[PDB]
């Protein structure tokens, strides 16, 4: 309940215009994520006059207001097409893992830097019973001191918001066997 | 004094209040916050009554 | 004073309510809100009974 | 007994407790969870006190 | 009465609660709703006694 009224309460304590701009967010991130993905590459008028542009700044501020004072470990799921890996290492219906697939994954992701950029919801724990389970690649990610985290709730759990603009390194990856299903978690 | 003769004291029932189940987020079954007398009226109120 | 004499007082159960576990988020193993009371009338309308 | 004669009861407070105000964006505050008692000693040792 | 004469009273203990620590998101220690009842039932069903 600690992190609930946590939550709960850093999202009074901020503008109506970012309260608006997360509000907005707890139903429309798919387009306001590939907003925050692709929002660069226009012109300035074009930037500027867009009319998802300004909340997305609003949201954005929201992140940068509650920065970490230490490293904190973050888990979330992730396609495999997000590292370059254009098939499907298992169908979502099976349970295993080949091992060809697993080590064409490994093979394809030894040694490469992958940036990132937009809007991302993550956990503070591993995804068990009831959590969303929706690819066979989970990744376990370090942010670093100084990194804007925001908390939230959808109507019935809480997530955090953060926006990513790094790039990330995988180290080494496992097979994990979750409620009994295969999956594979990456470390970077 | 009433009691101590032909008197009888008679219980009724004004109303019933309960639970129901529904499963959360996980396959688990919850009764907690799911009261029946939010639904009564309304049954009361669409229905016809068979005995 | 019928308490006196060869009568006795005699206990019987009319119902026990009690918890189950689950692990949650974190692997720690939660027996709070998990009422066996929820399942019971399920179990007995699905199952037959061995003695 | 001693106390009707000269004896007088004397009253002295040992401390107070009581919430701040915290404000937003907009003019809403929030004085519940804001203790005071939390920033006494803080604020008691890193002053110097003027009367 | 039968207490003032050569009886005496034994204490014996049915069961203990109590809680055991763990660390939440940050550093910090959480001995709350971490209930050591919850895994008494699960270490003596796994495990041998020795003394």
């Given at each position: 309940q600690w992190e609930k009224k946590e939550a709960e309460r850093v999202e009074k304590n901020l503008d109506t215009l970012e309260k608006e701009a997360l509000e907005l967010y707890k139903k429309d991130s798919e387009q306001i994520s590939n907003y925050s993905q692709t929002r660069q590459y226009f012109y300035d008028y074009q930037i500027e006059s867009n009319p998802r542009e300004k909340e997305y700044k609003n949201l954005r501020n929201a992140i940068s207001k509650n920065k970490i004072d230490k490293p904190i470990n973050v888990y979330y799921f992730e396609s495999?097409?997000?590292?370059?890996?254009?098939?499907?290492?298992?169908?979502?219906?099976?349970?295993?893992?080949?091992?060809?697939?697993?080590?064409?994954?490994?093979?394809t992701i030894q040694d490469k830097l992958f940036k990132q950029d937009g809007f991302k919801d993550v956990s503070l724990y591993e995804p068990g019973n009831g959590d969303e389970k929706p690819t066979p690649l989970l990744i376990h990610l370090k942010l670093p001191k100084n990194t804007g985290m925001l908390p939230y709730i959808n109507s019935n759990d809480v997530k955090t918001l953060i926006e990513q603009d790094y790039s990330i390194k995988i180290d080494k990856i496992v097979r994990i066997v979750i409620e009994g299903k295969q999956y594979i978690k990456a470390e970077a | 004094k009433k009691l101590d003769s032909g008197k009888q004291i008679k219980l009724e029932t004004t109303q019933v209040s309960g639970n129901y189940g529904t499963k959360n987020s996980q396959g688990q079954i919850i009764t907690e916050g799911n009261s029946w007398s939010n639904y009564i009226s309304q049954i009361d109120s669409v229905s016809a009554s068979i005995i």
């Open positions: 495999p097409e997000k590292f370059a890996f254009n098939k499907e290492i298992r169908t979502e219906n099976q349970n295993e893992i080949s091992l060809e697939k697993f080590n064409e994954l490994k093979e | -």
